[PDB]
Design a protein around this ligand. Structure first.
Ligand SMILES: O=P(O)(O)O[C@H]1[C@@H](OP(=O)(O)O)[C@H](OP(=O)(O)O)[C@@H](OP(=O)(O)OP(=O)(O)O)[C@H](OP(=O)(O)O)[C@H]1OP(=O)(O)O
Ligand SMILES: O=P(O)(O)O[C@H]1[C@@H](OP(=O)(O)O)[C@H](OP(=O)(O)O)[C@@H](OP(=O)(O)OP(=O)(O)O)[C@H](OP(=O)(O)O)[C@H]1OP(=O)(O)O
Ligand SMILES: O=P(O)(O)O[C@H]1[C@@H](OP(=O)(O)O)[C@H](OP(=O)(O)O)[C@@H](OP(=O)(O)OP(=O)(O)O)[C@H](OP(=O)(O)O)[C@H]1OP(=O)(O)O
Ligand SMILES: O=P(O)(O)O[C@H]1[C@@H](OP(=O)(O)O)[C@H](OP(=O)(O)O)[C@@H](OP(=O)(O)OP(=O)(O)O)[C@H](OP(=O)(O)O)[C@H]1OP(=O)(O)O
Ligand SMILES: O=P(O)(O)O[C@H]1[C@@H](OP(=O)(O)O)[C@H](OP(=O)(O)O)[C@@H](OP(=O)(O)OP(=O)(O)O)[C@H](OP(=O)(O)O)[C@H]1OP(=O)(O)O
Lengths: 368, 363, 361, 369
């Protein structure tokens, strides 16, 4: 029934159990991390075991014959004690009670909460053409044992520790108002005659995998012909911590072969689905995980909370529909000119919503 | 059918024959001046005949300022050494003209400018100036022990041109990006300009690609693209000229929160300019074969001042923006992209000769 | 004997007269620009003449075989009409009398949220391009149709690049010494470094007495004491460029042996004159000009985003101690201070001059 | 005075002589194995004598009795005939000509060459804490006699064979990599201020026994104190054939006595010498020979040649400088992690360069305790 994710320390003294790999941010609040640590009471005798939740922005990558540039900023750190027991985590959950019963009396609960001022899982490995380096926001759940002298020696032995890279996934809020169409229009005067472009989306928020119906209305009062209409989903990424890196990548494209001749108008609805699967080249785009992993998608739209400096988000991700019109010259070779406009939208995961049966699995994510 | 250019001295004692009026500079090397002098053996008896190549910068309309940039002289009569032609053109001319025909070869060095001159307009401060190239054949004689003489009547001068042709190399594809944030606006106006290549030829069309990204709440009302010629006199007087030698005004406007990409084609030509004063030419205004001056090409470790007149070309793109002019700026929204303008690359038996007067055809 | 600065348009239709090249910012308020425009009434018939004050940040430079990157942000724009004619000053009344009835006054004021004249031409070693904050006074004539065609003809316009110079405020409290101390534990024994300046604000050309107190309780020797004035420049608009340059240095030959203490006062004078290489340093004008100095300390006003200053300039005293081993180690510390021009001052005869600033070599 | 290494077969019929125990790999090419076999012509009558060079990766214990206790992958095998003599039979090298003269007319030369795609002598005996078993790359020079029986079965007796475990030792090329450098910075939770660490080595290649000057620049703009600066030489071992075993061990450590207080910077050069002698515990570390032997050192850096699959190297060995900063009021307050950076470098042996007089010795390597 309920799949539980487990990882064990090298020295087999500390084992951590989580209900999920991915924890839901739905704007209003964030799903807290409720898990249990199974200690070997022999191997933790006279020792203290803690669990920490760390959110960190990182920037840099390994390059041969290049100077190693690394940068880390911790955006959140919290730590509770699981052993010896003290009820650090306060009130308990059903998942914990059920796991304690199944695992035995050496099982201790932890609850680490997320605040409201953190970004969601975003990371980016650049392409050859791209100027800056690998960067991302990681979320680490680390259970580790300290000795009674190790607090004075500032030592946390590696073999007694276990770390899990969880994801903070952006879901839509549960109460949302009815959604107005995302629609703009432009009037491109050419020889004092207008070329009018109206672009309309069904709504403002789309879900990963959901088709985006882009309605394009070209009214051509000019003496020129609209030769081509290209519609893109562009992902715009702004690294806002160590280096002001900028990425703009097409994650979906449809190119109609419609012409709009002089003194005529054309309305057309193209459907685009921005998906990581569409992109052979998975570098230079904001993902919510590593390229190698299967459960990795396009990064959701950053949602900056009121009175929160955007820089503490580390990487800003936004999506837009771009419409390019190729317009004929009167007589030339590249006299053909292009006009383009953008319509912003947000992309995220859908809204969120006994005695359990537990199947235990290694936390490690499946590859491709 | 090879056209040969001839000029004859007043006293008919010395006649000079050149293959060309215009000699090719293609950066790597410069085409030397290979010609022949036909003497009247009666009228040069006991006389010596020389041919000189002089490059001089002049400034003024009496005679105001001269700087000699190069001088070389050879002897044609009496004959020097083997006296056999060094080129096919000479061998062929000697055969056609007879045994009173003597070859000369005057070479150009690599540190000289090309034919540039400038006659100013009423609006312009500063005077006429230019770099001239003179081929002069003249006879010397002595009636005294105490002095040799050089009569004007025994001399013949030709004003040849050193014409700039393209090298094998081209510079990287020229590109500019400019952006403006006007007073009280959080939003940029981005202008990107691109040319197909770095070197264009006289008469060749220049495709200027302009990318206006307008994130402002203002409208780009006009996009004007110019070829500007920039002239810097660098010897007697620090005179500066900047003139439009081509202009195209796109019909498209760029409304708020939109972007426009557009390719305008310009051809910088002397023919476009009714007013031919205040611009760097490669010859006199009156002459038909006169064009816009080619881009100066300063060689490494050569002081730019020995070029006399520096000529450069650039594409200027001016954006006219609504509701700033007089309101959020007293200035102009523009960027420049440099390029070089010159003549095409060079192309790398017994001839039939038609002889013509060297004098260039007028308008 | 008041020296007046004049410049005339190409078409000789508009001539502008200013009292100063340099206008004083003393934190509390900024000295406004009071001048006059002399029109040729024949050449401005049916035309309107305006004067604008523009403050702009610029970034970029011309480079052969390199992509031309240019960037401008206007930080302030204001415009008044001088012709046809629409409180005055003594300088204006006096200039009108001397020049005639075709002379019209203008007053353009500065707000409190602008930086002062700062610019920077980089060195070979430096990444990043030329940038600066310029102040333009431009007098120009428009035609009666030119307001509808959005056109300002160049030949009818005249521009002056004035400076906004940072002076200290006129009422200032008594100044606490700028002092910090550090304890560098070495084998659990402290090496204590105290650095102290006489005051917090120094003037360009004023000597800075740096008092350095080394207390060495370690078993190591302080072999060398170097004291620097470092200029720190942060470009904060187009590109996050960073410069740190020594504009003054004194290297004592003092040793502080184990279990001893040494107090020493070095005097440094941060000056552009000390620097042969004048590139990679924040100046208040062009390198070529004579009246150009080191840029004054940026003074960010409360609740003003530092980014609208364009270039941030700060000064600090750096103390480097070379400490022996048994290879040697270097410890260093910084003490911030502010550098600016002194406090301002609690029928005329006019000599007219071209606005163009005097050069060096 | 050239020391020659000799081993003799149990039956005294075949004796092998080598100039060296250790043969030089300097990237560009590898020093070939030039030796001679002395046969007893009575005891090899109607017999053929060969010499083989085998490079093999092994994992587990050495095969006992009949049981296969080892995983074996052969990376190179070559064999030549010494007896009866092949062709001209004259020496190809000065060492051979000289040995033939000194030993007599029953002395026959052999030359076995190394290719460019092999690893160098690497082996590893694990510690109690370590998962995974003993493994290594061995180089065997084996001289052995074959004879034919009355049924058409040829025989290779153990008693007629002699095997020598030579080493392929990594010496430096002509090229060196660029001066290695790292920069790291941290902004801790609730701190607006960076802690900057810059690390620099003098060069990219160091020799065994050569001191490594590690220059560390700590710029501390934080309100916290750097309480400790520890600098390590870490050896990283990756077994890449039978089992994906990973080892990372400190082979040298220096702890600076300086602390870096708030709003200060410290530049400091610590000298480390990564040596097997520093390590009492010699298990869990990549060596170039057996622990018991005296001439055994730390394994040199693996040098993977272009377009050669790294798996045919068997064991990958790399070295790095690690700098750990211990920062006040962090551990269990603003981090459950470590403040550290790594700078890679390569560790190997130095660059290479009448009748001579021979002293003969047993090939067996000298032990310790
Ligand atoms: O800092 P390092 O590189 O020296 O290593 C850590 C620790 O590694 P870790 O941090 O990954 O857990 C070592 O264990 P391992 O890497 O072999 O597992 C431990 O060695 P140990 O107990 O003798 O173990 P064995 O001899 O039985 O192998 C060492 O102790 P010291 O050097 O003697 O103080 C520790 O140093 P510190 O920071 O002072 O606590
Ligand atoms: O360094 P890391 O975080 O990037 O990941 C490394 C490795 O770290 P180390 O070898 O530098 O010590 C991880 O080991 P521990 O952190 O558990 O100690 C290991 O497990 P993991 O973190 O659970 O798995 P992930 O979801 O992170 O992939 C991971 O597994 P593999 O994907 O199957 O190879 C490796 O991936 P890679 O780097 O792509 O080779
Ligand atoms: O001073 P210059 O160089 O400008 O030339 C003068 C004149 O110079 P002089 O004063 O020494 O006599 C030339 O006579 P010569 O001394 O060379 O024999 C003459 O012939 P040219 O050189 O073949 O012809 P171009 O190609 O130079 O025009 C030229 O053309 P004509 O008008 O058709 O007579 C004149 O032009 P200008 O006065 O501008 O009209
Ligand atoms: O294209 P260019 O660069 O050669 O410009 C010409 C002129 O074009 P033209 O040669 O086709 O007639 C421009 O007018 P348009 O192209 O808009 O018609 C005019 O600009 P403007 O102020 O907006 O307009 P006006 O009110 O003065 O007409 C410009 O004046 P400046 O740059 O201010 O000095 C002129 O310069 P110059 O040659 O010195 O007199
Ligand atoms: O944009 P700029 O500040 O670089 O100025 C340009 C030029 O402006 P334009 O070409 O845009 O019209 C100025 O001309 P006008 O103001 O008289 O119209 C000129 O004099 P200037 O600034 O008054 O003189 P000073 O203050 O320096 O004495 C200045 O000469 P330089 O003395 O060598 O600097 C030029 O500099 P450049 O080309 O870099 O050498």
């Amino acid at each position: 029934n309920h799949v539980i994710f487990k990882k064990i320390s090298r020295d087999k003294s500390v084992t951590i159990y989580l209900g999920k790999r991915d924890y839901i941010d739905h704007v209003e609040r964030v799903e807290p991390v409720d898990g249990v640590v199974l200690v070997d009471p022999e191997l933790v005798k006279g020792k203290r075991v803690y669990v920490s939740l760390t959110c960190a922005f990182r920037y840099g990558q390994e390059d041969i014959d290049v100077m190693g540039l690394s940068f880390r900023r911790d955006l959140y750190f919290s730590q509770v004690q699981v052993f010896p027991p003290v009820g650090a985590s306060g009130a308990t959950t059903r998942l914990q009670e059920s796991l304690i019963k199944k695992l035995g009396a050496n099982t201790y609960p932890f609850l680490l909460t997320f605040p409201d001022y953190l970004p969601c899982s975003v990371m980016l490995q650049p392409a050859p053409q791209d100027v800056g380096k690998s960067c991302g926001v990681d979320f680490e759940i680390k259970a580790f044992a300290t000795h009674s002298t190790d607090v004075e020696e500032d030592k946390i032995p590696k073999k007694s520790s276990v770390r899990l890279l969880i994801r903070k996934v952006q879901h839509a809020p549960r109460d949302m108002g009815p959604q107005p169409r995302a629609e703009a229009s432009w009037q491109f005067f050419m020889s004092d005659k207008p070329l009018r472009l109206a672009v309309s989306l069904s709504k403002e928020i789309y879900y990963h995998g959901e088709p985006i119906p882009v309605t394009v209305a070209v009214t051509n009062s000019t003496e020129k012909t609209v030769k081509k209409i290209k519609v893109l989903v562009e992902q715009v990424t702004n690294v806002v911590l160590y280096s002001s890196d900028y990425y703009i990548k097409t994650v979906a494209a449809e190119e109609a072969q419609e012409k709009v001749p002089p003194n005529s108008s054309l309305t057309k609805t193209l459907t685009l689905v921005p998906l990581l699967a569409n992109n052979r080249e998975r570098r230079g785009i904001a993902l919510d995980g590593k390229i190698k992993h299967e459960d990795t998608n396009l990064a959701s739209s950053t949602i900056i909370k009121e009175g929160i400096d955007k820089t503490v988000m580390g990487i800003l991700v936004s999506y837009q529909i771009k419409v390019k019109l190729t317009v004929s010259g009167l007589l030339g070779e590249l006299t053909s000119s292009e006009v383009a406009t953008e319509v912003p939208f947000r992309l995220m995961h859908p809204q969120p919503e006994q005695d359990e049966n537990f199947v235990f699995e290694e936390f490690a994510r499946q590859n491709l």
